[PDB]
Structure formats: structure tokens, C-alpha cells
Design a protein around this ligand. Sequence first.
Ligand SMILES: O=C(O)c1c[nH]c(-c2ccccc2)n1
Ligand SMILES: O=C(O)c1c[nH]c(-c2ccccc2)n1
Length: 355
Amino acid sequence: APQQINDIVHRTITPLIEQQKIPGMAVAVIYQGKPYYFTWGYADIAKKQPVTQQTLFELGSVSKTFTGVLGGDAIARGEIKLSDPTTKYWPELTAKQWNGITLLHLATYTAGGLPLQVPDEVKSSSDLLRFYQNWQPAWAPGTQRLYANSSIGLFGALAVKPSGLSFEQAMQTRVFQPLKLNHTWINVPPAEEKNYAWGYREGKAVHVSPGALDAEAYGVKSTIEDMARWVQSNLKPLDINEKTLQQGIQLAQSRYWQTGDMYQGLGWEMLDWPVNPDSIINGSDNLAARPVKAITPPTPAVRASWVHKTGATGGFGSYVAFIPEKELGIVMLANKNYPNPARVDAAWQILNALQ
Ligand SMILES: O=C(O)c1c[nH]c(-c2ccccc2)n1
Ligand SMILES: O=C(O)c1c[nH]c(-c2ccccc2)n1
């Protein structure tokens, strides 16, 4: 890399790893559109396997950005609309609280208080129907944001119904393949297991458990190289050859709702650039129910935004942030779930210096 980039990344990440006791980490900086890669520590402590550019990390909720984009792609294909009622794609959702809950509400955590987690006890798919049928909104649709896997997870399952593809097939063929994300997986194939890092919770090696709507909400694993490429695509959607994908990206970065300084996209979340670092840093701390202001009609993707997403599993912590107008981005993948504000802080420190 250029020395400027080498120096800011290292002087920022090294202390962070030390402070947080992160066993392994990979970082990519997109600078004037090109990727620069850094790796530290261990993919697998027991087997002494280092983190490389081919190491797979659990993205956790950064998976939601893929889901938003696949969702946006289905829109641009004319297969679904965000203004459609949920019942249009799940007619079995006959319970009366569902009247007026749209795909928009599902994708943006504004349905009326769908819970953060689908319960563990929901194994079968009729258990799932029961869960949504029996769910009681705390609020009218489109009035409060409460971040929820059961909300965007559902949007992801429904968005791919008209295609007739499974979520995974749809994701692989419509998002992963066109973008050349050849080491990105909903389900890690046995061929790639050698590269699958372990996560670490309280010093114990852990992989993400199977659960309802996992793939749609928190189930993607990826390498720093593919993740960099994800940032490049989202930075420059209009260089993407596939028409509906290109628009899908643009749709995921539209501003549908505003809470405080932040705007809710599809998966992605957005602030006006330049940004107050304390507004993103403290903003990122991990139930926070917030009133939302509808942006009528949604603002198309603003190039002068800080576009970002945090993501966690029991054993992993990820962060992606990019600034379209600066052609600037960062991916940070760690095999420990460490505080969000530390991530955002490291990321702002790096990006601010290169801007
Ligand atoms: O193997 C295939 O080509 C395949 C997999 N799924 C489909 C498909 C499913 C629903 C509607 C259209 C095609 N084709
Ligand atoms: O033909 C090749 O060189 C080729 C295609 N894919 C790979 C590859 C497979 C797994 C991990 C990394 C590269 N090599």
C-alpha cells in the first residue's frame, strides 16, 4: 500500500486489537476506488492458523445489506413492490394486525415492534406462521423503528417468493455471482471449511448456530477480498453491468426513514457527510425504540453520505463503512464480538485521515 494508508491503518488497528483482545482481524481500505488489505492474528487459535485474505468471517448483521440489495434487485425486476402488503406474499397471514404492514415496514424495522430475535423454540415453519400470527404490535405501522431480525429476515424470505428461488439460490445467482463474490456463502461448503475462522466468546471457539431466518438476517460468511469488492460495488453501483442489480444497490441506499441524524435504507444505514463522529460512535452502541419520520418520497442514494452497517454473531464482530463522493471505504472483520463504538471509532479515525 501507499505509506499514508499503511501508517493510519496500523497505528489505529494495532491498539484496537490489543485493547479489545481480538484474536484475529482482517481490514480492507478502499482508497480512490482501489483495495488495500491488512491482516492480524489468528483464524483458529488451537490450530495456529493465521487470518489471511482467504479467511471466512461471519458477517452477522452486515448480512442485512446483502438482503437489502437482493430485495432491491427483486424490486427493480418488478417481482415485488415495497408498497405491497405483507399478506400479498404470505396470504396465510390472516391475523388482523397485519392489514397495512407493507414490505417497506418489514425491510426497515418499522412494522410496529417485531422482536429483535425470532424465538429459539420456533423450529418448524408452522411454528414460524404461528409466531407472526400471534405477534402483537406495540405501535401502528410506520411510526417507530425497532431493529429486528424477525422483521428484515421476513422481508428477505418474502422478497424472493415470486422468483421461485430459495433465498440462497436467489442470493448466489443474483448478487454473489454477478459481483464475483466467489468466496461468500450463506452455507459454507466443505471445500471452504479450511478457511472458516472460529469465533471466540469468553475464550471458547464458536460458530453461529442454525436458527429461523438466519440466512436472511445474519447468515453470510465472507472474506476481506469479497467484502472489499462488496464496498466497491456499493460505492459505484452505476459501473455494475446487470441493470436490476445496479438499481438494487441504489435502492438499498435510499433514505426511507429518519431518526435523529440517521436515515434507514434497505439494510444500510446512512448519515449526511461530513458527519459528527460522536453521532455515529455513540449512535452505534448495542432494545432502542425510536419514532421515525417518513421521508416522503424516499431520497435516492446521496453520494455525500456516510453509509454503514454493524454486524455481530456470538463470536464475531464486523463493520463496513463507505463514503460514495470520496470513493472511500473500509471493512473490518474480527473473530470477536467487541463493542460497536470501538469499531466505528477505528473506522472514522482511518477514513477521516484519508479523506
Ligand atoms: O436449477 C435451476 O435452473 C433452477 C433452480 N430454481 C429454478 C427456478 C425456481 C423457480 C422458478 C423458476 C426457476 N431453476
Ligand atoms: O482455476 C483456478 O485457478 C481457480 C479457480 N478458483 C480457484 C480457487 C478456489 C478456491 C479458493 C481460491 C481460489 N482457483
